[PDB]
């Protein structure tokens, strides 16, 4: 949910979020000396953002009711504006790189997760074993049988 310039005008976050949010600070990979002006953000929009929307647009926004033919004057303004990165802008004004994850399920096979057992085996002892999937109890021993590859 939430409001403000972000999550409401340029990257809307849907409710009932299924994902993860990471924002690790950065002050050397970015905010170059003198000034870092490479990124841009939208300022004015005629409406809000539907969840998971990417509104990349360079058309000049009109605020009043008079059409404008690509002229930057009154009631016709360019929403895109640059970040004011500075070497010592402030602790609350340092460039923050953020990565947001998205988990999703559907009627499809699942192909991303990580298991870990890697437990050493023991032979010739009453042991409760669990290989991939199957489980049981017994005394594992070496054999001379031949399996197909």
């Amino acid at each position: 949910g939430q409001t403000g310039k972000i999550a409401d005008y340029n990257y809307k976050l849907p409710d009932d979020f299924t994902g993860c949010v990471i924002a690790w600070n950065s002050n050397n990979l970015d905010s170059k000396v003198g000034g870092n002006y490479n990124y841009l953000y939208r300022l004015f929009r005629k409406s809000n953002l539907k969840p998971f929307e990417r509104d990349i647009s360079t058309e000049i926004y009109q605020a009043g009711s008079t059409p404008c033919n690509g002229v930057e004057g009154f009631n016709c303004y360019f929403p895109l504006q640059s970040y004011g990165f500075q070497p010592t802008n402030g602790v609350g004004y340092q460039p923050y790189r953020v990565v947001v994850l998205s988990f999703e399920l559907l009627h499809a096979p699942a192909t991303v997760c990580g298991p870990k057992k890697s437990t050493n085996l023991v032979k010739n002892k009453c042991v409760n074993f669990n290989f991939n999937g199957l489980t049981g109890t017994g005394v594992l021993t070496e054999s001379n049988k031949k399996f197909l590859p």
Partner: antibody
Amino acid sequence: QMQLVQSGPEVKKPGTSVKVSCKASGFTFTSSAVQWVRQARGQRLEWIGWIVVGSGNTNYAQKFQERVTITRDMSTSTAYMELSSLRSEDTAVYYCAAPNCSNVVCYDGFDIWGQGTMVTVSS
Amino acid sequence: EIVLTQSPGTLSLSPGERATLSCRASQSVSSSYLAWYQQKPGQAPRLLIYSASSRATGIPDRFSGSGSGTDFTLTISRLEPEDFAVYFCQQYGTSPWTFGQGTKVEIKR
């Protein structure tokens, strides 16, 4: 109701600056822009410059290109004018300008103006 | 070069007049960004008409005025006794925004 507030009188000396603030109330000031003009004693009107509350768009006159800064600030939703190097001919009256923009629609004219502060430099 | 030179300097007639004021421009400017201001001396001016052919939120006695790309004028039919102030042109179609010269009206005695 909806209106604009300007600062009080100013009396200065040659070799200083001025600070006139435009408090906007009763309307969405964020989606707006402010123009500054100057009226002398019973003469024609002139233009100083203008800025956008949305930030990143300031335009000054050819003769008002220098020695003037229009700070905006968003925390208090106001607009400030700073004109440096006060000169004897600069004893005048300053006004304020703003449209009546309300959310979706911005008013096409500068309906609301400030009361207008004054500056006088002398010995 | 941009000017808003105003043909009528001063007017002096009794209450009730055609009250024609002219603001012919020099360079061609779209008649979409232009405004009229009435300053009664002693206080701030007010907004009267904008965008050449339009009207404010509320204006008395139906002030009407229209022009063209390089012709601008305003008429005030049946000039009311109270309407006596300074009138100023203004255009913001293109920078710089040069203002109006100024017109004055008064009664005949």
